[PDB]
Amino acid sequence: FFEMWVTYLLTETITWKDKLKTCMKNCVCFDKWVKQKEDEWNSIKFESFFFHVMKKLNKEKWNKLMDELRNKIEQDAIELLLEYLKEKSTICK
Amino acid sequence: VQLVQSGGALVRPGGSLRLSCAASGFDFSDFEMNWVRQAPGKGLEWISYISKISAASFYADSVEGRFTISRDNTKNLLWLEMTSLRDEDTAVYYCARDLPGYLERVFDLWGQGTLVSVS
Amino acid sequence: IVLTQSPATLSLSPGEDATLSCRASQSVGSALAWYQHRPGQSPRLLIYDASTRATGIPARFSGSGSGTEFTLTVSSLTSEDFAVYYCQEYKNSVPPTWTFGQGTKVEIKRT
Protein backbone atom coordinates (compact mmCIF):
# COMPACT_ATOMS: atom_id res chain seq x y z
CA PHE A 1 0.00 0.00 0.00
CA PHE A 2 2.79 2.39 0.96
CA GLU A 3 4.93 2.06 -2.14
CA MET A 4 2.10 2.69 -4.59
CA TRP A 5 1.02 5.55 -2.31
CA VAL A 6 4.41 7.24 -2.72
CA THR A 7 4.12 6.52 -6.47
CA TYR A 8 0.73 8.28 -6.68
CA LEU A 9 2.05 11.11 -4.48
CA LEU A 10 4.98 11.75 -6.85
CA THR A 11 2.78 11.36 -9.95
CA GLU A 12 0.14 13.78 -8.71
CA THR A 13 2.90 16.13 -7.49
CA ILE A 14 4.30 16.27 -11.04
CA THR A 15 0.75 16.71 -12.39
CA TRP A 16 0.02 19.56 -9.93
CA LYS A 17 3.34 21.18 -10.84
CA ASP A 18 2.20 21.03 -14.48
CA LYS A 19 -1.21 22.47 -13.55
CA LEU A 20 0.25 25.38 -11.55
CA LYS A 21 2.47 26.59 -14.41
CA THR A 22 0.07 29.51 -14.96
CA CYS A 23 0.28 30.51 -11.28
CA MET A 24 3.96 31.51 -11.41
CA LYS A 25 -8.79 28.95 -8.05
CA ASN A 26 -6.22 26.18 -8.47
CA CYS A 27 -4.28 27.33 -5.39
CA VAL A 28 -7.16 26.50 -3.01
CA CYS A 29 -7.66 23.05 -4.56
CA PHE A 30 -3.89 22.46 -4.49
CA ASP A 31 -3.82 23.42 -0.80
CA LYS A 32 -6.71 21.00 -0.17
CA TRP A 33 -4.76 18.26 -1.97
CA VAL A 34 -1.62 19.00 0.08
CA LYS A 35 -3.68 18.95 3.30
CA GLN A 36 -5.26 15.65 2.20
CA LYS A 37 -1.84 14.09 1.54
CA GLU A 38 -0.57 15.44 4.87
CA ASP A 39 -3.56 13.85 6.63
CA GLU A 40 -2.85 10.57 4.82
CA TRP A 41 0.80 10.76 5.92
CA ASN A 42 -0.41 11.43 9.47
CA SER A 43 -2.57 8.31 9.19
CA ILE A 44 0.26 6.14 7.85
CA LYS A 45 2.92 6.91 10.47
CA PHE A 46 12.77 8.97 -4.31
CA GLU A 47 15.21 8.11 -7.07
CA SER A 48 14.26 4.43 -6.77
CA PHE A 49 10.62 5.34 -7.59
CA PHE A 50 11.59 6.16 -11.19
CA PHE A 51 9.97 3.22 -12.94
CA HIS A 52 6.49 3.32 -11.36
CA VAL A 53 6.09 7.09 -11.78
CA MET A 54 7.44 7.02 -15.34
CA LYS A 55 5.06 4.19 -16.14
CA LYS A 56 2.30 6.55 -15.01
CA LEU A 57 3.86 9.57 -16.80
CA ASN A 58 6.02 9.01 -19.89
CA LYS A 59 7.56 12.52 -19.67
CA GLU A 60 10.89 13.46 -18.09
CA LYS A 61 9.20 16.77 -15.15
CA TRP A 62 10.89 13.98 -13.19
CA ASN A 63 14.32 15.56 -13.66
CA LYS A 64 12.86 18.94 -12.68
CA LEU A 65 11.28 17.55 -9.49
CA MET A 66 14.41 15.69 -8.38
CA ASP A 67 16.58 18.75 -9.07
CA GLU A 68 14.22 20.97 -7.07
CA LEU A 69 14.24 18.54 -4.13
CA ARG A 70 18.04 18.24 -4.25
CA ASN A 71 18.27 22.03 -4.28
CA LYS A 72 15.91 22.02 -1.29
CA ILE A 73 17.99 19.54 0.76
CA GLU A 74 21.33 21.14 -0.20
CA GLN A 75 10.57 8.40 6.45
CA ASP A 76 12.67 11.53 5.91
CA ALA A 77 12.37 12.05 2.15
CA ILE A 78 8.57 11.91 2.58
CA GLU A 79 8.86 14.74 5.12
CA LEU A 80 11.09 16.68 2.70
CA LEU A 81 8.55 16.28 -0.12
CA LEU A 82 5.66 17.34 2.10
CA GLU A 83 7.58 20.41 3.31
CA TYR A 84 8.25 21.17 -0.37
CA LEU A 85 4.52 20.87 -1.17
CA LYS A 86 3.50 23.08 1.78
CA GLU A 87 6.17 25.63 0.82
CA LYS A 88 4.82 25.73 -2.74
CA SER A 89 1.25 25.97 -1.42
CA THR A 90 2.28 28.96 0.71
CA ILE A 91 3.63 30.89 -2.30
CA CYS A 92 0.97 29.76 -4.81
CA LYS A 93 -0.69 33.19 -4.89
CA VAL B 1 19.96 -1.56 -35.26
CA GLN B 2 23.52 -2.05 -34.00
CA LEU B 3 25.57 -1.35 -30.86
CA VAL B 4 29.32 -1.13 -31.50
CA GLN B 5 31.61 -0.94 -28.48
CA SER B 6 35.18 0.33 -28.06
CA GLY B 7 37.14 -2.91 -27.83
CA GLY B 8 39.08 -4.32 -24.93
CA ALA B 9 41.92 -2.65 -23.07
CA LEU B 10 44.54 -3.54 -20.46
CA VAL B 11 44.50 -1.42 -17.31
CA ARG B 12 46.43 -1.51 -14.04
CA PRO B 13 44.50 -1.98 -10.77
CA GLY B 14 43.36 1.24 -9.16
CA GLY B 15 43.33 2.87 -12.60
CA SER B 16 40.66 4.30 -14.87
CA LEU B 17 39.09 3.34 -18.19
CA ARG B 18 36.36 4.85 -20.36
CA LEU B 19 34.26 2.38 -22.30
CA SER B 20 32.20 3.48 -25.28
CA CYS B 21 29.16 2.06 -27.05
CA ALA B 22 28.22 3.71 -30.34
CA ALA B 23 24.67 2.89 -31.40
CA SER B 24 23.32 3.00 -34.94
CA GLY B 25 20.16 2.28 -36.89
CA PHE B 26 17.68 3.69 -34.37
CA ASP B 27 16.95 6.73 -32.22
CA PHE B 28 19.29 6.78 -29.22
CA SER B 29 17.15 9.28 -27.28
CA ASP B 30 14.12 6.96 -27.39
CA PHE B 31 15.83 3.95 -25.77
CA GLU B 32 17.09 3.25 -22.26
CA MET B 33 20.65 1.94 -22.05
CA ASN B 34 22.33 -0.70 -19.92
CA TRP B 35 25.69 -2.21 -19.03
CA VAL B 36 25.94 -5.95 -18.33
CA ARG B 37 29.11 -7.53 -16.94
CA GLN B 38 30.29 -11.13 -17.40
CA ALA B 39 33.28 -12.33 -15.41
CA PRO B 40 35.10 -15.43 -16.77
CA GLY B 41 33.15 -18.45 -15.55
CA LYS B 42 30.68 -16.51 -13.41
CA GLY B 43 27.79 -15.60 -15.70
CA LEU B 44 25.95 -12.43 -16.64
CA GLU B 45 25.55 -9.63 -14.11
CA TRP B 46 23.91 -6.24 -14.64
CA ILE B 47 25.97 -3.29 -13.40
CA SER B 48 24.46 -0.06 -14.75
CA TYR B 49 21.40 1.56 -16.28
CA ILE B 50 20.65 5.01 -17.66
CA SER B 51 17.30 6.33 -18.84
CA LYS B 52 16.31 8.08 -22.08
CA ILE B 53 17.71 11.29 -20.58
CA SER B 54 20.03 11.40 -17.55
CA ALA B 55 17.05 11.74 -15.18
CA ALA B 56 17.63 8.26 -13.75
CA SER B 57 20.84 6.28 -13.30
CA PHE B 58 20.99 2.98 -11.43
CA TYR B 59 23.95 0.86 -10.35
CA ALA B 60 24.49 -2.59 -8.92
CA ASP B 61 25.37 -2.83 -5.23
CA SER B 62 28.95 -3.88 -6.03
CA VAL B 63 29.63 -0.93 -8.34
CA GLU B 64 28.11 2.09 -6.54
CA GLY B 65 30.60 4.89 -6.02
CA ARG B 66 33.11 3.43 -8.47
CA PHE B 67 31.45 3.37 -11.88
CA THR B 68 29.45 6.03 -13.74
CA ILE B 69 27.20 5.53 -16.77
CA SER B 70 26.71 8.53 -19.06
CA ARG B 71 25.18 8.94 -22.49
CA ASP B 72 25.36 11.48 -25.31
CA ASN B 73 22.06 11.16 -27.14
CA THR B 74 23.12 13.55 -29.92
CA LYS B 75 26.39 11.67 -30.60
CA ASN B 76 24.78 8.25 -29.86
CA LEU B 77 27.57 7.25 -27.46
CA LEU B 78 27.06 5.46 -24.14
CA TRP B 79 29.98 5.57 -21.72
CA LEU B 80 30.92 3.85 -18.48
CA GLU B 81 33.64 5.87 -16.77
CA MET B 82 35.47 3.30 -14.66
CA THR B 83 37.27 4.36 -11.48
CA SER B 84 39.28 2.48 -8.79
CA LEU B 85 39.28 -0.85 -10.61
CA ARG B 86 39.79 -3.88 -8.38
CA ASP B 87 40.98 -7.37 -9.37
CA GLU B 88 37.42 -8.75 -9.59
CA ASP B 89 36.53 -6.41 -12.47
CA THR B 90 38.40 -8.52 -15.04
CA ALA B 91 35.36 -9.33 -17.17
CA VAL B 92 33.56 -8.86 -20.48
CA TYR B 93 31.39 -5.74 -20.56
CA TYR B 94 28.21 -5.79 -22.65
CA CYS B 95 26.22 -2.77 -23.80
CA ALA B 96 22.51 -3.56 -23.82
CA ARG B 97 19.40 -1.76 -25.07
CA ASP B 98 16.21 -1.77 -23.01
CA LEU B 99 12.75 -2.33 -24.51
CA PRO B 100 10.20 0.51 -24.60
CA GLY B 101 8.21 0.56 -21.40
CA TYR B 102 9.65 1.43 -18.00
CA LEU B 103 8.06 -1.65 -16.45
CA GLU B 104 9.62 -4.02 -19.02
CA ARG B 105 13.19 -3.78 -17.75
CA VAL B 106 14.81 -6.29 -20.10
CA PHE B 107 17.90 -6.15 -22.31
CA ASP B 108 16.74 -6.30 -25.91
CA LEU B 109 19.75 -5.83 -28.20
CA TRP B 110 23.33 -6.23 -27.06
CA GLY B 111 26.76 -4.95 -28.02
CA GLN B 112 29.79 -6.76 -29.38
CA GLY B 113 31.46 -7.25 -26.00
CA THR B 114 34.55 -5.68 -24.45
CA LEU B 115 37.06 -7.73 -22.46
CA VAL B 116 38.40 -5.47 -19.71
CA SER B 117 41.26 -7.20 -17.91
CA VAL B 118 43.20 -5.81 -14.97
CA SER B 119 46.69 -6.89 -13.95
CA ILE C 1 15.07 -11.81 -6.37
CA VAL C 2 17.18 -15.03 -6.13
CA LEU C 3 16.73 -16.97 -9.44
CA THR C 4 17.73 -20.67 -9.53
CA GLN C 5 18.42 -22.49 -12.84
CA SER C 6 17.87 -26.14 -11.70
CA PRO C 7 18.58 -27.86 -15.10
CA ALA C 8 22.15 -26.43 -15.19
CA THR C 9 24.21 -28.55 -17.64
CA LEU C 10 21.78 -30.55 -19.84
CA SER C 11 23.03 -33.42 -22.09
CA LEU C 12 20.36 -33.52 -24.88
CA SER C 13 20.42 -34.70 -28.55
CA PRO C 14 19.91 -32.03 -31.29
CA GLY C 15 16.43 -31.75 -32.85
CA GLU C 16 14.71 -32.59 -29.52
CA ASP C 17 12.60 -30.39 -27.15
CA ALA C 18 14.34 -29.05 -23.99
CA THR C 19 12.58 -27.77 -20.86
CA LEU C 20 14.23 -25.50 -18.30
CA SER C 21 13.37 -23.86 -14.99
CA CYS C 22 13.97 -20.62 -13.11
CA ARG C 23 12.78 -20.74 -9.50
CA ALA C 24 12.37 -17.36 -7.81
CA SER C 25 12.81 -16.90 -4.08
CA GLN C 26 9.97 -14.35 -3.96
CA SER C 27 6.71 -13.83 -5.82
CA VAL C 28 7.69 -11.84 -8.92
CA GLY C 29 4.75 -12.21 -11.31
CA SER C 30 5.11 -12.11 -15.08
CA ALA C 31 8.23 -9.94 -14.69
CA LEU C 32 10.82 -12.46 -15.83
CA ALA C 33 12.88 -12.63 -19.02
CA TRP C 34 15.01 -15.28 -20.75
CA TYR C 35 18.30 -14.99 -22.61
CA GLN C 36 20.52 -17.15 -24.84
CA HIS C 37 24.31 -16.80 -24.71
CA ARG C 38 25.46 -18.64 -27.82
CA PRO C 39 29.20 -19.45 -27.84
CA GLY C 40 31.33 -16.81 -29.50
CA GLN C 41 28.40 -14.38 -29.55
CA SER C 42 26.56 -11.79 -27.51
CA PRO C 43 23.46 -12.76 -25.52
CA ARG C 44 20.07 -12.25 -27.11
CA LEU C 45 16.61 -11.83 -25.64
CA LEU C 46 14.16 -14.68 -26.22
CA ILE C 47 11.20 -14.03 -23.88
CA TYR C 48 10.60 -10.81 -21.95
CA ASP C 49 7.38 -11.39 -19.93
CA ALA C 50 7.92 -15.11 -19.02
CA SER C 51 5.36 -16.05 -21.72
CA THR C 52 5.98 -13.83 -24.77
CA ARG C 53 8.46 -13.95 -27.67
CA ALA C 54 10.91 -11.23 -28.62
CA THR C 55 11.20 -9.72 -32.10
CA GLY C 56 13.37 -11.77 -34.44
CA ILE C 57 12.90 -14.99 -32.45
CA PRO C 58 11.43 -18.18 -33.98
CA ALA C 59 8.21 -19.62 -32.57
CA ARG C 60 9.99 -22.67 -31.09
CA PHE C 61 11.14 -20.49 -28.16
CA SER C 62 8.16 -20.58 -25.79
CA GLY C 63 7.77 -20.11 -22.06
CA SER C 64 5.34 -20.16 -19.17
CA GLY C 65 5.15 -19.24 -15.51
CA SER C 66 3.54 -16.44 -13.54
CA GLY C 67 4.45 -16.94 -9.88
CA THR C 68 7.71 -18.24 -8.44
CA GLU C 69 8.10 -21.13 -10.92
CA PHE C 70 9.14 -20.29 -14.48
CA THR C 71 9.96 -22.54 -17.42
CA LEU C 72 11.43 -22.03 -20.89
CA THR C 73 10.66 -24.75 -23.44
CA VAL C 74 12.78 -24.72 -26.60
CA SER C 75 11.80 -27.23 -29.29
CA SER C 76 13.75 -28.87 -32.15
CA LEU C 77 17.26 -28.05 -30.91
CA THR C 78 19.41 -26.81 -33.80
CA SER C 79 23.20 -26.37 -33.77
CA GLU C 80 22.96 -22.88 -32.23
CA ASP C 81 20.50 -23.84 -29.46
CA PHE C 82 23.31 -25.51 -27.50
CA ALA C 83 24.18 -22.46 -25.44
CA VAL C 84 23.89 -21.09 -21.91
CA TYR C 85 20.44 -19.77 -20.98
CA TYR C 86 19.90 -17.07 -18.35
CA CYS C 87 16.74 -15.87 -16.63
CA GLN C 88 16.31 -12.31 -15.39
CA GLU C 89 13.70 -10.87 -13.04
CA TYR C 90 12.67 -7.23 -13.39
CA LYS C 91 10.14 -7.07 -10.53
CA ASN C 92 8.51 -3.68 -9.93
CA SER C 93 9.68 -3.28 -6.35
CA VAL C 94 11.58 -0.37 -4.83
CA PRO C 95 14.60 -0.38 -5.30
CA PRO C 96 14.54 -2.03 -8.75
CA THR C 97 16.68 -5.13 -9.23
CA TRP C 98 18.15 -6.73 -12.37
CA THR C 99 19.04 -10.20 -11.12
CA PHE C 100 20.18 -13.03 -13.40
CA GLY C 101 20.38 -16.75 -12.78
CA GLN C 102 23.49 -18.90 -12.65
CA GLY C 103 22.97 -20.06 -16.23
CA THR C 104 21.61 -23.41 -17.31
CA LYS C 105 23.48 -25.06 -20.17
CA VAL C 106 22.27 -27.33 -22.97
CA GLU C 107 24.86 -29.69 -24.44
CA ILE C 108 24.88 -32.50 -27.00
CA LYS C 109 24.61 -35.92 -25.39
CA ARG C 110 26.69 -38.87 -26.59
CA THR C 111 27.51 -42.46 -25.63
Side-chain angles (χ1 to χ4, degrees):
Chain A
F1 177 79
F2 188 56
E3 299 296 329
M4 301 145 267
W5 181 87
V6 176
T7 296
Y8 288 125
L9 179 61
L10 290 166
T11 300
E12 291 176 359
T13 294
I14 292 168
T15 298
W16 268 110
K17 164 183 321 293
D18 181 65
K19 274 192 141 213
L20 297 177
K21 205 82 81 183
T22 61
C23 297
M24 183 278 288
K25 74 212 171 313
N26 287 342
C27 290
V28 175
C29 186
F30 176 71
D31 190 62
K32 288 179 180 179
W33 176 87
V34 172
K35 270 169 186 159
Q36 182 64 50
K37 293 299 186 184
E38 187 174 30
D39 286 346
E40 290 175 359
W41 179 238
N42 287 338
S43 293
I44 291 167
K45 65 212 171 83
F46 279 149
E47 184 178 1
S48 63
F49 284 94
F50 175 81
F51 293 111
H52 300 81
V53 174
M54 289 304 82
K55 154 91 171 53
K56 303 273 161 223
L57 302 172
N58 290 315
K59 314 143 181 83
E60 281 145 300
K61 285 200 159 178
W62 178 260
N63 195 52
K64 289 181 180 179
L65 179 62
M66 273 317 100
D67 194 67
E68 287 169 346
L69 292 174
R70 286 193 295 268
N71 291 335
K72 181 65 173 174
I73 191 167
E74 295 180 1
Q75 293 293 313
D76 295 296
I78 302 300
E79 290 285 303
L80 176 62
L81 178 58
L82 291 170
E83 288 298 315
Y84 176 74
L85 290 173
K86 296 179 18 174
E87 185 179 63
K88 204 162 291 303
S89 180
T90 299
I91 62 170
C92 186
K93 185 176 180 180
Chain B
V1 290
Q2 188 178 5
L3 271 69
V4 169
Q5 300 196 37
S6 66
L10 179 54
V11 65
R12 304 299 178 187
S16 66
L17 184 62
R18 184 141 60 231
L19 302 179
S20 297
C21 172
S24 296
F26 59 87
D27 197 10
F28 200 64
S29 297
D30 193 40
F31 279 104
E32 323 173 78
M33 282 286 119
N34 284 309
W35 274 105
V36 179
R37 185 176 70 186
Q38 196 190 34
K42 188 68 181 294
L44 289 171
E45 181 253 339
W46 169 89
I47 52 152
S48 294
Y49 157 83
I50 197 166
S51 179
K52 285 154 159 179
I53 321 174
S54 296
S57 184
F58 287 87
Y59 303 114
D61 56 354
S62 58
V63 299
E64 288 180 353
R66 314 211 320 279
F67 290 149
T68 298
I69 175 168
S70 296
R71 87 215 293 271
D72 203 346
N73 63 6
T74 185
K75 290 176 70 176
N76 310 327
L77 295 150
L78 176 76
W79 299 282
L80 185 87
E81 290 97 350
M82 284 146 88
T83 301
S84 71
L85 274 179
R86 303 142 180 201
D87 268 353
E88 51 255 60
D89 309 311
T90 293
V92 178
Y93 284 84
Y94 290 112
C95 178
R97 177 180 53 121
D98 196 278
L99 280 179
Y102 298 94
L103 290 193
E104 281 96 320
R105 288 201 322 279
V106 310
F107 311 133
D108 194 28
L109 188 153
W110 297 59
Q112 86 198 29
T114 297
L115 172 83
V116 172
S117 66
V118 309
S119 66
Chain C
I1 283 87
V2 181
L3 296 188
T4 297
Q5 244 128 1
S6 295
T9 315
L10 269 195
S11 315
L12 313 159
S13 56
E16 90 169 67
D17 306 6
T19 191
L20 304 177
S21 68
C22 179
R23 187 191 302 272
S25 69
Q26 299 182 8
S27 175
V28 171
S30 295
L32 187 137
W34 284 92
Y35 295 89
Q36 180 182 57
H37 187 93
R38 294 174 288 169
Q41 263 164 10
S42 298
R44 64 190 211 150
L45 179 70
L46 299 174
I47 305 182
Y48 56 91
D49 290 330
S51 66
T52 180
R53 180 180 59 82
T55 301
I57 302 300
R60 54 205 196 73
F61 291 95
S62 198
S64 66
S66 178
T68 61
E69 291 264 351
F70 299 88
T71 284
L72 161 65
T73 61
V74 62
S75 298
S76 297
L77 292 170
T78 187
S79 67
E80 295 183 0
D81 291 332
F82 294 100
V84 176
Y85 299 78
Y86 301 90
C87 62
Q88 173 212 320
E89 61 88 19
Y90 56 91
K91 200 197 149 182
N92 58 5
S93 57
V94 176
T97 60
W98 290 265
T99 296
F100 288 81
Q102 291 56 30
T104 190
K105 185 177 184 292
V106 183
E107 66 179 6
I108 302 167
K109 86 184 173 279
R110 293 170 184 166
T111 79

PDB file of all heavy atoms in Angstrom, chain A residues 2-15:
ATOM      1  N   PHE A   2       1.932   1.222   0.796  1.00  0.00           N
ATOM      2  CA  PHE A   2       2.794   2.389   0.965  1.00  0.00           C
ATOM      3  C   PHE A   2       3.507   2.771  -0.323  1.00  0.00           C
ATOM      4  O   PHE A   2       3.637   3.959  -0.642  1.00  0.00           O
ATOM      5  CB  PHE A   2       3.824   2.126   2.059  1.00  0.00           C
ATOM      6  CG  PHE A   2       4.624   3.333   2.423  1.00  0.00           C
ATOM      7  CD1 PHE A   2       4.003   4.495   2.840  1.00  0.00           C
ATOM      8  CD2 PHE A   2       6.005   3.313   2.324  1.00  0.00           C
ATOM      9  CE1 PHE A   2       4.745   5.610   3.163  1.00  0.00           C
ATOM     10  CE2 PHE A   2       6.753   4.425   2.648  1.00  0.00           C
ATOM     11  CZ  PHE A   2       6.122   5.575   3.069  1.00  0.00           C
ATOM     12  N   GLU A   3       3.997   1.777  -1.061  1.00  0.00           N
ATOM     13  CA  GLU A   3       4.931   2.063  -2.140  1.00  0.00           C
ATOM     14  C   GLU A   3       4.181   2.650  -3.332  1.00  0.00           C
ATOM     15  O   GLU A   3       4.620   3.627  -3.954  1.00  0.00           O
ATOM     16  CB  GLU A   3       5.668   0.781  -2.524  1.00  0.00           C
ATOM     17  CG  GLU A   3       6.492   0.165  -1.376  1.00  0.00           C
ATOM     18  CD  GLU A   3       7.643   1.015  -0.865  1.00  0.00           C
ATOM     19  OE1 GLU A   3       8.240   1.777  -1.637  1.00  0.00           O
ATOM     20  OE2 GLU A   3       7.961   0.905   0.338  1.00  0.00           O
ATOM     21  N   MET A   4       3.000   2.094  -3.615  1.00  0.00           N
ATOM     22  CA  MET A   4       2.099   2.689  -4.594  1.00  0.00           C
ATOM     23  C   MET A   4       1.559   4.034  -4.124  1.00  0.00           C
ATOM     24  O   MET A   4       1.250   4.889  -4.956  1.00  0.00           O
ATOM     25  CB  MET A   4       0.943   1.738  -4.899  1.00  0.00           C
ATOM     26  CG  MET A   4       1.366   0.380  -5.438  1.00  0.00           C
ATOM     27  SD  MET A   4       0.293  -0.961  -4.883  1.00  0.00           S
ATOM     28  CE  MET A   4       1.150  -1.511  -3.409  1.00  0.00           C
ATOM     29  N   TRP A   5       1.441   4.246  -2.809  1.00  0.00           N
ATOM     30  CA  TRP A   5       1.018   5.554  -2.314  1.00  0.00           C
ATOM     31  C   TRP A   5       2.069   6.621  -2.589  1.00  0.00           C
ATOM     32  O   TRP A   5       1.731   7.745  -2.975  1.00  0.00           O
ATOM     33  CB  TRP A   5       0.705   5.493  -0.820  1.00  0.00           C
ATOM     34  CG  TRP A   5       0.250   6.802  -0.253  1.00  0.00           C
ATOM     35  CD1 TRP A   5      -1.025   7.281  -0.220  1.00  0.00           C
ATOM     36  CD2 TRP A   5       1.067   7.795   0.377  1.00  0.00           C
ATOM     37  NE1 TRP A   5      -1.052   8.513   0.381  1.00  0.00           N
ATOM     38  CE2 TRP A   5       0.220   8.851   0.758  1.00  0.00           C
ATOM     39  CE3 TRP A   5       2.432   7.894   0.649  1.00  0.00           C
ATOM     40  CZ2 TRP A   5       0.693   9.990   1.398  1.00  0.00           C
ATOM     41  CZ3 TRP A   5       2.900   9.027   1.284  1.00  0.00           C
ATOM     42  CH2 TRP A   5       2.034  10.059   1.652  1.00  0.00           C
ATOM     43  N   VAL A   6       3.350   6.288  -2.403  1.00  0.00           N
ATOM     44  CA  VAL A   6       4.413   7.238  -2.722  1.00  0.00           C
ATOM     45  C   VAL A   6       4.491   7.454  -4.232  1.00  0.00           C
ATOM     46  O   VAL A   6       4.753   8.571  -4.702  1.00  0.00           O
ATOM     47  CB  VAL A   6       5.751   6.758  -2.124  1.00  0.00           C
ATOM     48  CG1 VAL A   6       6.901   7.673  -2.514  1.00  0.00           C
ATOM     49  CG2 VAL A   6       5.652   6.672  -0.616  1.00  0.00           C
ATOM     50  N   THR A   7       4.228   6.395  -5.012  1.00  0.00           N
ATOM     51  CA  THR A   7       4.116   6.522  -6.467  1.00  0.00           C
ATOM     52  C   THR A   7       3.025   7.506  -6.885  1.00  0.00           C
ATOM     53  O   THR A   7       3.275   8.406  -7.697  1.00  0.00           O
ATOM     54  CB  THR A   7       3.844   5.153  -7.087  1.00  0.00           C
ATOM     55  OG1 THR A   7       4.957   4.284  -6.847  1.00  0.00           O
ATOM     56  CG2 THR A   7       3.562   5.274  -8.571  1.00  0.00           C
ATOM     57  N   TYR A   8       1.815   7.359  -6.335  1.00  0.00           N
ATOM     58  CA  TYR A   8       0.733   8.278  -6.680  1.00  0.00           C
ATOM     59  C   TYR A   8       0.987   9.681  -6.147  1.00  0.00           C
ATOM     60  O   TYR A   8       0.580  10.657  -6.784  1.00  0.00           O
ATOM     61  CB  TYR A   8      -0.615   7.768  -6.171  1.00  0.00           C
ATOM     62  CG  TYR A   8      -1.167   6.584  -6.932  1.00  0.00           C
ATOM     63  CD1 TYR A   8      -1.524   5.415  -6.275  1.00  0.00           C
ATOM     64  CD2 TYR A   8      -1.394   6.660  -8.299  1.00  0.00           C
ATOM     65  CE1 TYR A   8      -2.041   4.335  -6.963  1.00  0.00           C
ATOM     66  CE2 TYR A   8      -1.913   5.586  -8.998  1.00  0.00           C
ATOM     67  CZ  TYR A   8      -2.236   4.426  -8.321  1.00  0.00           C
ATOM     68  OH  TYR A   8      -2.757   3.353  -9.006  1.00  0.00           O
ATOM     69  N   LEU A   9       1.675   9.800  -5.003  1.00  0.00           N
ATOM     70  CA  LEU A   9       2.051  11.111  -4.481  1.00  0.00           C
ATOM     71  C   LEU A   9       3.010  11.835  -5.418  1.00  0.00           C
ATOM     72  O   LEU A   9       2.810  13.016  -5.721  1.00  0.00           O
ATOM     73  CB  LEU A   9       2.676  10.958  -3.097  1.00  0.00           C
ATOM     74  CG  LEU A   9       3.162  12.231  -2.413  1.00  0.00           C
ATOM     75  CD1 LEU A   9       2.010  13.185  -2.200  1.00  0.00           C
ATOM     76  CD2 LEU A   9       3.822  11.886  -1.091  1.00  0.00           C
ATOM     77  N   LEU A  10       4.032  11.134  -5.918  1.00  0.00           N
ATOM     78  CA  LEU A  10       4.976  11.748  -6.850  1.00  0.00           C
ATOM     79  C   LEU A  10       4.329  12.051  -8.198  1.00  0.00           C
ATOM     80  O   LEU A  10       4.596  13.102  -8.796  1.00  0.00           O
ATOM     81  CB  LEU A  10       6.191  10.841  -7.028  1.00  0.00           C
ATOM     82  CG  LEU A  10       7.107  10.738  -5.815  1.00  0.00           C
ATOM     83  CD1 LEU A  10       8.073   9.589  -5.967  1.00  0.00           C
ATOM     84  CD2 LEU A  10       7.860  12.034  -5.661  1.00  0.00           C
ATOM     85  N   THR A  11       3.465  11.148  -8.682  1.00  0.00           N
ATOM     86  CA  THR A  11       2.779  11.355  -9.955  1.00  0.00           C
ATOM     87  C   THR A  11       1.845  12.559  -9.893  1.00  0.00           C
ATOM     88  O   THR A  11       1.866  13.425 -10.778  1.00  0.00           O
ATOM     89  CB  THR A  11       2.001  10.094 -10.333  1.00  0.00           C
ATOM     90  OG1 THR A  11       2.906   8.993 -10.467  1.00  0.00           O
ATOM     91  CG2 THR A  11       1.257  10.286 -11.639  1.00  0.00           C
ATOM     92  N   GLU A  12       1.046  12.656  -8.830  1.00  0.00           N
ATOM     93  CA  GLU A  12       0.135  13.782  -8.709  1.00  0.00           C
ATOM     94  C   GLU A  12       0.869  15.060  -8.321  1.00  0.00           C
ATOM     95  O   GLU A  12       0.381  16.152  -8.614  1.00  0.00           O
ATOM     96  CB  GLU A  12      -0.967  13.437  -7.713  1.00  0.00           C
ATOM     97  CG  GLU A  12      -1.908  12.359  -8.229  1.00  0.00           C
ATOM     98  CD  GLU A  12      -2.945  11.939  -7.211  1.00  0.00           C
ATOM     99  OE1 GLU A  12      -2.925  12.474  -6.083  1.00  0.00           O
ATOM    100  OE2 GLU A  12      -3.785  11.075  -7.541  1.00  0.00           O
ATOM    101  N   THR A  13       2.058  14.950  -7.716  1.00  0.00           N
ATOM    102  CA  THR A  13       2.895  16.126  -7.491  1.00  0.00           C
ATOM    103  C   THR A  13       3.411  16.699  -8.806  1.00  0.00           C
ATOM    104  O   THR A  13       3.378  17.918  -9.014  1.00  0.00           O
ATOM    105  CB  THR A  13       4.055  15.759  -6.564  1.00  0.00           C
ATOM    106  OG1 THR A  13       3.539  15.421  -5.271  1.00  0.00           O
ATOM    107  CG2 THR A  13       5.041  16.907  -6.418  1.00  0.00           C
ATOM    108  N   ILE A  14       3.864  15.828  -9.716  1.00  0.00           N
ATOM    109  CA  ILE A  14       4.298  16.275 -11.042  1.00  0.00           C
ATOM    110  C   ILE A  14       3.121  16.847 -11.830  1.00  0.00           C
ATOM    111  O   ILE A  14       3.247  17.877 -12.511  1.00  0.00           O
ATOM    112  CB  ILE A  14       4.987  15.114 -11.787  1.00  0.00           C
ATOM    113  CG1 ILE A  14       6.309  14.761 -11.110  1.00  0.00           C
ATOM    114  CG2 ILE A  14       5.261  15.460 -13.235  1.00  0.00           C
ATOM    115  CD1 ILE A  14       6.910  13.469 -11.598  1.00  0.00           C
ATOM    116  N   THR A  15       1.946  16.215 -11.710  1.00  0.00           N
ATOM    117  CA  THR A  15       0.748  16.713 -12.386  1.00  0.00           C
ATOM    118  C   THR A  15       0.315  18.076 -11.839  1.00  0.00           C
ATOM    119  O   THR A  15      -0.059  18.968 -12.610  1.00  0.00           O
ATOM    120  CB  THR A  15      -0.379  15.682 -12.258  1.00  0.00           C
ATOM    121  OG1 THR A  15       0.022  14.464 -12.896  1.00  0.00           O
ATOM    122  CG2 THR A  15      -1.659  16.170 -12.918  1.00  0.00           C
TER     123      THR A  15
END
